[PDB]
Amino acid sequence: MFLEKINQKTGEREWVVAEEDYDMAQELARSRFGDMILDFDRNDKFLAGLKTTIAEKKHENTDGKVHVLDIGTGTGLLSLMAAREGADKVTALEVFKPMGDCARHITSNSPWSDKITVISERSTDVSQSRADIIVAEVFDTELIGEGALRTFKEALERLAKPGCRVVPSTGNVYIVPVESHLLKMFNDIPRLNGEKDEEPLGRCSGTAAVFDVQLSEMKTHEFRELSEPIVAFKFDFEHEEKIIFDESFVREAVAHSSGTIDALLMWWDIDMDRNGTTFIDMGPKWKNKNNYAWRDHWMQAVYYLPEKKKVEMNQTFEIVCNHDEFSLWFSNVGKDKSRSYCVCGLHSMLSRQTVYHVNEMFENQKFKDEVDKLSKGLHVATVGEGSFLGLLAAKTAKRVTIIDGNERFRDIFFKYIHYYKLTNVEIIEKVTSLTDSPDIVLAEPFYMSAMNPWNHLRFLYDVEVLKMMHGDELRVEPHMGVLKAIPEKFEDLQNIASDVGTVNGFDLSFFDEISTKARTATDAIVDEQSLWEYAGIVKGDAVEILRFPIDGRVSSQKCVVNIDNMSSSNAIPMWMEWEFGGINLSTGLLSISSAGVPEWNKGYKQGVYFPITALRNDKSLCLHALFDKSTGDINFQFGKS
């Protein structure tokens, strides 16, 4: 139940929900699954699969009728598709109630009301005619992480006729081994002196959770394939005995080039009807010639072998491909075939992008030059949470005090101190335990706790506590920070937030209604996204929003600004920059090309606002921004002029 109210700043109408309804709504706010419904290719492929199987079943079984089951019906799209194009009957399940009513609602007010009936159970909990066809879009980037195996497997035994047909009928998962400095950087334990054999934290597989990334937006020069795609797994969705939760396979292939396997890229394809003619194929842009379509709710993934594996031109090599019910992982021959978890400690604290970020800074000569310059022969103190900056300062500083409140990072930092035998660094927990006045404070700033990637402003409070102790003249860097936005025309990104409307000639606008109400109730106004992964063209200069000078005091800060060039843009990115001594660190936009293509930092996610629909066509948008001394939070509202 959505409670209407009026934004007192922008006049727009918004909703809210009562605490008991919050979780329900949040879920329902995620029920769009980004661009899922606007993935016209995925739709045209389910349809086509439905045409074939409905026809062939019509033909086969004697009473020329056909009963289709839709698991995870969502808005009902897939049932509407089944009914139209022939299903005498369509029963359609959905574990999530509010999405149950949505699908009954839209499915009632329809030409196919007669044929379609919505049940709000999980497939795996049910007992009833038997189904002649099962249709289910119940996949994620890993293919199996959303329960698809059990879902088809069990539906097949209990819910469907023998000789059932299923849409999709079949799939493969492919891995491609690549050498890539880039990809390594997302997983590599930071090596302080740069050499290959440094292992200050011992060895680790890194994080086991999926690394989904848009590999289409990766630059050709950033990686080098060593071989042709390898089939890891084949799934057969029509035969329960072929669906198996825990599996392992050694796979073989012939390398077409020598190189080290820094990563294995993966994606899947599905055969919509078992004919070998109509596929959804998640191969990226650079290796997907007949069924490429941008989308975001599905993507490709990167995986890392636990140990180094080298491969040689024209020589055969093997990779062990493993899955349990929900996850895929890969390993080397003669090595433990179990799913591994970070044991190093670092993997499990830092995101992939932050791990990249730390390897980037460790390798950055220009940034390392300013640290050296600023640190020389001095006592420096570092603030941050999980920020390795202190360990650079150490190259040149007389003495470094790293202040980090998180016990787990201190242990990590103590391991770096031990492994490289650093003789000039101590670590303390609390800002107030810095009792020897340092010559300078250095920060990035980075706090792993930041609620939002554009907001590491705890730095500003830590600075004040150090000024209270040691005088307003305390030298600190960075000396100034600024929040910045820029109007951008994204190629496709915006489909994750824009209205869904009429799809394959079906009116889903009811779902836009409840989805928008849910979203206004639960979402942040400014999304977060790894913008290096999304293509587009910038439509104006970056504009300044809030600025945070460092010579105190900390102060709430207000900004109301017009953002122009929106009539041809479709999003507004936001990020932070800092003057660290004599250089500029950007957590976002790094450069813009002659043709207007922006480049973004891979080591952070950035903010993006997508114009609400009442605002889709305005030429300028009013952006109210607000930093609050009391919470350290920043709040945004976006309105008309």
Ligand SMILES: Nc1ncnc2c1ncn2[C@@H]1O[C@H](CSCC[C@H](N)C(=O)O)[C@@H](O)[C@H]1O
């Ligand atoms: N075994 C199961 N039984 C019922 N619903 C399921 C399920 N597994 C997943 N779901 C639901 O299935 C949906 C997957 S999203 C796909 C929705 C819609 N069919 C479409 O194609 O656009 C989610 O709404 C989720 O809650």
